[PDB]
Symmetry: C3
Subunit: 267 residues, 3 copies
Amino acid sequence: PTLRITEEPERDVYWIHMHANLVNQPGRPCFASRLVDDIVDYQRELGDRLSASHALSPHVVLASDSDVFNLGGDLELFCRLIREGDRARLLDYAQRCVRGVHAFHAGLGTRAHSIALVQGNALGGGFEAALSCHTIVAEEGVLMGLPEVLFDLFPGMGAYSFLCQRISPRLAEKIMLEGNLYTASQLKEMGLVDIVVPVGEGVAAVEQVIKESRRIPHAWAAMREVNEIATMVPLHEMMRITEIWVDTAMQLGEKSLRTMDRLVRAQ
Amino acid sequence: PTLRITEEPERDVYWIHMHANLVNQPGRPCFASRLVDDIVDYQRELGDRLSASHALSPHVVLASDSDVFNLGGDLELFCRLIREGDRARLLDYAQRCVRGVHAFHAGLGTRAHSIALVQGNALGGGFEAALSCHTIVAEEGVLMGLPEVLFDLFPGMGAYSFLCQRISPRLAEKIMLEGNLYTASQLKEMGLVDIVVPVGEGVAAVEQVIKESRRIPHAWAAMREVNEIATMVPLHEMMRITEIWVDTAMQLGEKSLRTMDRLVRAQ
Amino acid sequence: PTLRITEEPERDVYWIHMHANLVNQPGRPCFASRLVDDIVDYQRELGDRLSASHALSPHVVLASDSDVFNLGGDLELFCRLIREGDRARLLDYAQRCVRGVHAFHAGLGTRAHSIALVQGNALGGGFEAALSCHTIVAEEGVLMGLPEVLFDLFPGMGAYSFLCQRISPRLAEKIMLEGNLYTASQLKEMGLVDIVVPVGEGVAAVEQVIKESRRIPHAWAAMREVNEIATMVPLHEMMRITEIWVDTAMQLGEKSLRTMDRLVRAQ
């Protein structure tokens, strides 16, 4: 695979393209355990590869082969799991997700620079996916935001953890619970997106970032380490949020459930 | 007794209107020892009442029956207590003052939703009261701010705490000590007031807040709990701060007290 | 030494002008070892004096007699200690540099109000020294910024610590790593500079800040102490960061150190 990885070990730059399968497949780009298990899987793999090769300031890019970035949780999965009373299975998929994004935010245990290239809409966990990377390149016109609150849920993964890095807890809460969508221009204003480049120019934008980020390889390494004893979010602290998140999905009434199923027909 | 409590159990919405004792009495719409004792004790009342009711995301509004939200602490008690040199009974007032705003900040130990309706002016303690609530609705052209520096004191009720949730702690320091005043629209552009509507229409827009918020009671509950880890202001930290405030106010000379009775006299 | 000291003990105001031995000597308005050692040593001196006097809310101003405020750390001492590889002594430089900016932050352990007077450009360690003070007064058309990133270093004598007090730590990091210079006017927009005034009214605006502050000695002391319960950057947390900084400095290659020689000669 569901991932269209791209290796480039001469420059130490690795481009992960999501929904590699959907080129030949029905639809619903989102965070299905297939994709969630492939990103995690690759992450350990390039985590030890780059660690063993002692690569100083590797780059990792998260991107997408679909027409959008990512839609969020696999919605049909939720309904199934919530209905069967299977919280164990739900918590598990949540935890896999936290592990997934936390790696971009922690530079794969290799103090990498993780860039996000958002060429299409990035709702829900897709926005969490996008806020985990260090540098957020979006296109003009893209729409971002998290509408999970229209089903009486919220964005349990990071989001309150990654948003609190650019803004205050009150406003992070507001963005979460207000359930409003936003354009890249707006998100640049709120400092929630790092650089918005013109139509279709986002590909070479991340190329520009790589050129300059590689100019300061020792400095980037001390930053990541310095955040890591100061403001970087601990892994086990995100784990507690999903516990809270998984018990919240587990109480989701039928009215909300039909609404998810409402989004299932047309997701 | 000093509070006019409109409470409706079928909707689980509860309004606390302060200063109702002063519709025929002369004035001082401030944090009179009785007003603090009442506000806190009623919180304790609704406190187990809602916990036994197992209510989920209940709403509590705090508002004013006077022409001002509040005028802050009761400068007459301060003068008299400072003069007698008795921090024992002065610290008691401060603590009971901290227990009232922290209840609103804690959602009353039932993860409630706090909304302050700021119809009048809110000064010092009054302005902190507004700041402890999760939502701040105010009417156009209202003044908020803390002039507690005019007598070489600082707002120790809970301002530092509830400010650093919306704005950087350095800016928190400036606003407190600068002793200035801001109109409600300005405070909106600072992240200090969330909603701002024309005059008269405050109760309406609290009502629109309660509607939308009662639409997602699980997400609210989650946020309360998510906040409760890290984010939320502890109660021992707030206890320490007033213990500093009490020691400071104990060192006040007859100069400051003169300014105090000036303020009492100009309100 | 290496400084001018305008003592004013009846006012409990004290002026520390750096680069006194610059009207008569060569140049390099930077943070030479002696200077850092003279700024520490006088802190201990003034500080024990103020403490033993039982002073309340003193005032220490940091200002420059050279053409600029301070160009920051001594690159000429680093093209030596890195090439020679004496890590022990290099750490010693940063440790004393850290103690130096931190005393200003912490009011010299006497709850004193530090104020930076930015007559001229303040780059690198100069910008940290500035940000370390509680108040920053700067003239029009002055540049401040962190250029050290241009030769693959990172600001590690305080930058992260004192920046995050004013803005988001994702803004802090962007500001360091970008290595841009910002004009005083726009910096004060960014919340970083406190007070922007015309050229010449250097002591003019500082002189007023001193006036307003002693108008409220007791509140300053209280607010100073509250920032000690939970908002003061801990001394040991700052030592830990220097360890990264010097461990970054040993890994510099002739590419970087060549540029520092070029920088040393331009100043």
